[PDB]
Structure formats: C-alpha cells, structure tokens
mmCIF file of C-alpha atoms in Angstrom:
data_model
loop_
_atom_site.group_PDB
_atom_site.id
_atom_site.type_symbol
_atom_site.label_atom_id
_atom_site.label_comp_id
_atom_site.label_asym_id
_atom_site.label_seq_id
_atom_site.Cartn_x
_atom_site.Cartn_y
_atom_site.Cartn_z
ATOM 1 C CA UNK A 1 0.000 0.000 0.000
ATOM 2 C CA UNK A 2 1.007 3.666 -0.209
ATOM 3 C CA UNK A 3 -1.937 5.798 0.905
ATOM 4 C CA UNK A 4 -5.083 3.682 1.077
ATOM 5 C CA UNK A 5 -6.977 0.776 -0.460
ATOM 6 C CA UNK A 6 -8.212 1.012 -4.051
ATOM 7 C CA UNK A 7 -11.681 -0.565 -3.999
ATOM 8 C CA UNK A 8 -15.278 0.509 -3.461
ATOM 9 C CA UNK A 9 -15.719 2.031 -0.019
ATOM 10 C CA UNK A 10 -18.855 -0.075 0.287
ATOM 11 C CA UNK A 11 -17.137 -3.357 -0.486
ATOM 12 C CA UNK A 12 -14.666 -2.365 2.210
ATOM 13 C CA UNK A 13 -17.287 -2.544 4.945
ATOM 14 C CA UNK A 14 -18.498 -5.810 3.455
ATOM 15 C CA UNK A 15 -15.202 -7.678 3.535
ATOM 16 C CA UNK A 16 -14.853 -6.505 7.122
ATOM 17 C CA UNK A 17 -18.417 -7.103 8.176
ATOM 18 C CA UNK A 18 -17.790 -10.535 6.703
ATOM 19 C CA UNK A 19 -15.082 -11.369 9.239
ATOM 20 C CA UNK A 20 -17.026 -9.868 12.135
ATOM 21 C CA UNK A 21 -17.605 -11.879 15.402
ATOM 22 C CA UNK A 22 -15.378 -13.031 18.258
ATOM 23 C CA UNK A 23 -11.937 -14.654 18.148
ATOM 24 C CA UNK A 24 -10.911 -16.187 21.447
ATOM 25 C CA UNK A 25 -13.981 -18.267 20.746
ATOM 26 C CA UNK A 26 -12.897 -19.490 17.359
ATOM 27 C CA UNK A 27 -9.456 -20.150 18.771
ATOM 28 C CA UNK A 28 -10.888 -22.540 21.332
ATOM 29 C CA UNK A 29 -12.677 -24.430 18.570
ATOM 30 C CA UNK A 30 -9.782 -24.241 16.130
ATOM 31 C CA UNK A 31 -7.556 -25.985 18.657
ATOM 32 C CA UNK A 32 -10.126 -28.601 19.629
ATOM 33 C CA UNK A 33 -10.826 -29.403 15.973
ATOM 34 C CA UNK A 34 -7.206 -29.591 14.849
ATOM 35 C CA UNK A 35 -6.409 -31.666 17.919
ATOM 36 C CA UNK A 36 -9.101 -34.273 17.389
ATOM 37 C CA UNK A 37 -8.506 -34.299 13.646
ATOM 38 C CA UNK A 38 -5.099 -32.948 12.671
ATOM 39 C CA UNK A 39 -5.291 -32.465 8.914
ATOM 40 C CA UNK A 40 -4.279 -28.905 8.016
ATOM 41 C CA UNK A 41 -6.255 -28.743 4.775
ATOM 42 C CA UNK A 42 -9.994 -28.109 4.557
ATOM 43 C CA UNK A 43 -12.770 -28.471 1.988
ATOM 44 C CA UNK A 44 -15.238 -25.803 0.903
ATOM 45 C CA UNK A 45 -18.410 -27.667 1.798
ATOM 46 C CA UNK A 46 -16.970 -28.498 5.176
ATOM 47 C CA UNK A 47 -15.859 -24.923 5.741
ATOM 48 C CA UNK A 48 -19.319 -23.664 4.864
ATOM 49 C CA UNK A 49 -20.645 -25.753 7.726
ATOM 50 C CA UNK A 50 -18.259 -24.009 10.106
ATOM 51 C CA UNK A 51 -19.301 -20.500 9.118
ATOM 52 C CA UNK A 52 -22.858 -21.701 9.555
ATOM 53 C CA UNK A 53 -22.168 -22.606 13.184
ATOM 54 C CA UNK A 54 -20.283 -19.611 14.632
ATOM 55 C CA UNK A 55 -21.733 -16.596 12.795
ATOM 56 C CA UNK A 56 -24.038 -17.092 9.821
ATOM 57 C CA UNK A 57 -24.801 -13.398 9.330
ATOM 58 C CA UNK A 58 -24.768 -12.805 5.585
ATOM 59 C CA UNK A 59 -24.462 -15.510 2.934
ATOM 60 C CA UNK A 60 -21.915 -18.233 3.849
ATOM 61 C CA UNK A 61 -21.844 -19.322 0.224
ATOM 62 C CA UNK A 62 -20.694 -15.904 -0.857
ATOM 63 C CA UNK A 63 -17.812 -15.666 1.577
ATOM 64 C CA UNK A 64 -16.827 -19.148 0.477
ATOM 65 C CA UNK A 65 -16.626 -18.129 -3.155
ATOM 66 C CA UNK A 66 -14.203 -15.514 -1.862
ATOM 67 C CA UNK A 67 -11.715 -17.611 0.032
ATOM 68 C CA UNK A 68 -11.461 -19.801 -3.016
ATOM 69 C CA UNK A 69 -11.145 -16.805 -5.293
ATOM 70 C CA UNK A 70 -7.968 -16.027 -3.323
ATOM 71 C CA UNK A 71 -6.740 -19.267 -1.790
ATOM 72 C CA UNK A 72 -7.989 -21.420 -4.679
ATOM 73 C CA UNK A 73 -7.386 -20.224 -8.218
ATOM 74 C CA UNK A 74 -6.506 -23.585 -9.740
ATOM 75 C CA UNK A 75 -5.190 -26.013 -7.124
ATOM 76 C CA UNK A 76 -7.758 -28.806 -7.250
ATOM 77 C CA UNK A 77 -10.054 -27.561 -4.465
ATOM 78 C CA UNK A 78 -8.505 -27.358 -0.994
ATOM 79 C CA UNK A 79 -7.156 -24.656 1.309
ATOM 80 C CA UNK A 80 -5.375 -24.420 4.647
ATOM 81 C CA UNK A 81 -7.587 -23.076 7.430
ATOM 82 C CA UNK A 82 -4.427 -22.367 9.393
ATOM 83 C CA UNK A 83 -3.085 -19.644 7.144
ATOM 84 C CA UNK A 84 -6.624 -18.291 7.150
ATOM 85 C CA UNK A 85 -6.708 -17.584 10.858
ATOM 86 C CA UNK A 86 -3.349 -15.881 10.603
ATOM 87 C CA UNK A 87 -4.610 -13.580 7.882
ATOM 88 C CA UNK A 88 -7.749 -13.088 9.929
ATOM 89 C CA UNK A 89 -5.646 -11.070 12.330
ATOM 90 C CA UNK A 90 -5.799 -8.357 9.693
ATOM 91 C CA UNK A 91 -9.593 -8.249 9.955
ATOM 92 C CA UNK A 92 -10.524 -8.513 13.629
ATOM 93 C CA UNK A 93 -11.057 -6.572 16.846
ATOM 94 C CA UNK A 94 -8.463 -6.354 19.608
ATOM 95 C CA UNK A 95 -5.192 -4.749 20.659
ATOM 96 C CA UNK A 96 -1.791 -4.925 18.991
ATOM 97 C CA UNK A 97 -0.066 -7.189 21.495
ATOM 98 C CA UNK A 98 -2.820 -9.763 21.078
ATOM 99 C CA UNK A 99 -2.087 -9.962 17.362
ATOM 100 C CA UNK A 100 1.488 -11.110 17.744
ATOM 101 C CA UNK A 101 0.326 -13.480 20.432
ATOM 102 C CA UNK A 102 -2.614 -14.694 18.384
ATOM 103 C CA UNK A 103 -0.237 -15.485 15.551
ATOM 104 C CA UNK A 104 1.977 -17.379 17.959
ATOM 105 C CA UNK A 105 -0.773 -19.517 19.430
ATOM 106 C CA UNK A 106 -1.676 -20.083 15.814
ATOM 107 C CA UNK A 107 1.463 -21.924 14.759
ATOM 108 C CA UNK A 108 1.770 -23.453 18.217
ATOM 109 C CA UNK A 109 -0.124 -26.590 17.240
ATOM 110 C CA UNK A 110 2.896 -28.710 18.069
ATOM 111 C CA UNK A 111 2.790 -28.295 21.837
ATOM 112 C CA UNK A 112 6.403 -27.193 21.487
ATOM 113 C CA UNK A 113 6.173 -23.483 22.259
ATOM 114 C CA UNK A 114 9.019 -22.943 19.796
ATOM 115 C CA UNK A 115 8.555 -22.205 16.096
ATOM 116 C CA UNK A 116 11.214 -22.601 13.420
ATOM 117 C CA UNK A 117 12.700 -19.915 11.209
ATOM 118 C CA UNK A 118 11.094 -21.395 8.111
ATOM 119 C CA UNK A 119 7.766 -21.056 9.875
ATOM 120 C CA UNK A 120 8.439 -17.390 10.520
ATOM 121 C CA UNK A 121 8.886 -16.688 6.834
ATOM 122 C CA UNK A 122 5.883 -18.861 6.053
ATOM 123 C CA UNK A 123 3.743 -16.938 8.525
ATOM 124 C CA UNK A 124 4.396 -13.541 6.977
ATOM 125 C CA UNK A 125 3.911 -15.165 3.586
ATOM 126 C CA UNK A 126 0.374 -16.166 4.466
ATOM 127 C CA UNK A 127 -0.460 -12.584 5.301
ATOM 128 C CA UNK A 128 1.270 -11.514 2.101
ATOM 129 C CA UNK A 129 -1.098 -13.743 0.147
ATOM 130 C CA UNK A 130 -4.305 -12.204 1.459
ATOM 131 C CA UNK A 131 -2.731 -8.786 0.933
ATOM 132 C CA UNK A 132 -2.993 -9.274 -2.835
ATOM 133 C CA UNK A 133 -6.749 -9.630 -2.400
ATOM 134 C CA UNK A 134 -7.128 -6.182 -0.836
ATOM 135 C CA UNK A 135 -4.433 -3.673 -1.709
ATOM 136 C CA UNK A 136 -2.325 -3.774 -4.863
ATOM 137 C CA UNK A 137 1.054 -5.410 -4.328
ATOM 138 C CA UNK A 138 3.739 -2.734 -4.923
ATOM 139 C CA UNK A 139 6.781 -3.370 -7.119
ATOM 140 C CA UNK A 140 9.835 -2.696 -4.972
ATOM 141 C CA UNK A 141 9.530 -5.037 -1.995
ATOM 142 C CA UNK A 142 9.569 -8.504 -3.512
ATOM 143 C CA UNK A 143 11.035 -11.430 -1.604
ATOM 144 C CA UNK A 144 9.999 -10.330 1.871
ATOM 145 C CA UNK A 145 12.551 -12.877 3.033
ATOM 146 C CA UNK A 146 15.390 -10.387 3.106
ATOM 147 C CA UNK A 147 13.248 -8.462 5.568
ATOM 148 C CA UNK A 148 12.492 -11.361 7.870
ATOM 149 C CA UNK A 149 16.151 -12.290 7.798
ATOM 150 C CA UNK A 150 16.977 -8.799 8.987
ATOM 151 C CA UNK A 151 14.921 -9.379 12.118
ATOM 152 C CA UNK A 152 16.749 -12.568 12.943
ATOM 153 C CA UNK A 153 19.936 -10.767 11.999
ATOM 154 C CA UNK A 154 18.949 -7.896 14.248
ATOM 155 C CA UNK A 155 18.736 -10.155 17.272
ATOM 156 C CA UNK A 156 21.640 -12.183 15.899
ATOM 157 C CA UNK A 157 20.339 -15.768 15.895
ATOM 158 C CA UNK A 158 21.559 -19.064 14.479
ATOM 159 C CA UNK A 159 19.949 -18.065 11.203
ATOM 160 C CA UNK A 160 17.918 -21.195 11.891
ATOM 161 C CA UNK A 161 17.499 -21.590 15.656
ATOM 162 C CA UNK A 162 13.949 -21.518 17.026
ATOM 163 C CA UNK A 163 12.272 -18.496 18.622
ATOM 164 C CA UNK A 164 9.658 -17.982 21.336
ATOM 165 C CA UNK A 165 6.588 -15.778 21.523
ATOM 166 C CA UNK A 166 8.171 -13.355 23.939
ATOM 167 C CA UNK A 167 11.288 -13.043 21.794
ATOM 168 C CA UNK A 168 9.366 -13.117 18.524
ATOM 169 C CA UNK A 169 7.550 -10.020 19.717
ATOM 170 C CA UNK A 170 10.866 -8.455 20.678
ATOM 171 C CA UNK A 171 12.230 -8.953 17.178
ATOM 172 C CA UNK A 172 9.269 -7.068 15.749
ATOM 173 C CA UNK A 173 9.552 -4.401 18.436
ATOM 174 C CA UNK A 174 12.892 -3.212 17.100
ATOM 175 C CA UNK A 175 11.013 -2.908 13.815
ATOM 176 C CA UNK A 176 8.021 -0.571 13.997
ATOM 177 C CA UNK A 177 7.471 -1.192 10.317
ATOM 178 C CA UNK A 178 5.836 -4.363 11.441
ATOM 179 C CA UNK A 179 3.904 -2.269 13.878
ATOM 180 C CA UNK A 180 2.888 0.313 11.275
ATOM 181 C CA UNK A 181 1.729 -2.298 8.779
ATOM 182 C CA UNK A 182 -1.460 -2.742 10.775
ATOM 183 C CA UNK A 183 -1.662 0.878 11.876
ATOM 184 C CA UNK A 184 -1.948 1.857 8.225
ATOM 185 C CA UNK A 185 -5.642 1.030 8.494
ATOM 186 C CA UNK A 186 -7.116 2.556 11.650
ATOM 187 C CA UNK A 187 -8.987 5.773 10.884
ATOM 188 C CA UNK A 188 -11.594 4.965 8.231
ATOM 189 C CA UNK A 189 -13.804 2.350 9.865
#
C-alpha cells in the first residue's frame, strides 16, 4: 500500500463485516478441531458448515466463493484453514499485542512453544497472500525474506534456531514497520 486501499468504499465494509464476530472463541474451537482431527487442509463444503455454526450473518456461500477466489485459483479444491486464521488477524477486533500473540498460538499446534525460522517466513507469507486480495502489491519489496532475515539478523540468531513468543515479539519491536503495517488502516472504519 502507499496511501489507502483502491476498492469501493462499500465493499470495504463488506469484507470486514464478513469477518465480524469473536476470536478467542474461534481459537478454542480451532484448537479442539485440529487436535481431534489434525489435517491442516480443509474443503469448501466443510468450511461452509463451520461459518454456519459460529456466525451465519450474511451468505456463507458468498464468503466461500471468496476464500477460493484467493486461496484457490486452480489447485484442485482445498485450502489451509491455518493460514486463514493468521490472515484473519488483519480483519478482527483487539489490541496490537494480542495480534502477535494470536499469531503465535496459531502456529503453536505442536505443543512445542518454539517455532522454526522457516515457519516465521511462512507466517508472513500467508499474510502476504491475502494482501494481494485487498491492496495492490507494490513493485519494490519482492522477496519479503530479506526483511524477515533482517529481524533474525537484528537479534543475531543461528539463522535457523527456534524463537519464542516473547522473543518473537521483541524482534518485531525493534522494527516498527511491522507495527505500522497494521496501523496503516485505523482511521476509516
């Protein structure tokens, strides 16, 4: 982005009003579902059933056609509900500290409490995917890897060692850019 989105102001409230509802609630279910049935991938029909259980406000079939329009252009017919929650952070309601934490508890489905570097780059990538569905991807910041590496380089890690929530948040702290990314959307709601 550079100044603001580039779509119909109306559609803006829709996409948002589409992700409305609670979170800590979905998190409880997301962990109980992935724990009883660890799969990672999810089907459309199945997903529709989920949206029809927590907050069937508008048309669940419409929102579905969306997720696929972004997470499914021509890959058979399956998407990862994990990367979805992560991107959800963009469209939600809470503080800033909860976001970083929310993302952590998101990839913490290994009861390890320690994520790997590769996961870090994969996490930001997920958010970078949904970003192409809202704002127009610029043309001077490709390969966000170099950026993520800087963080690890900032704290000086094993370029591969694992990191913890607490520290993960510290790495982003020394980089407000990660803090302004979300701030660049709080004054037109």
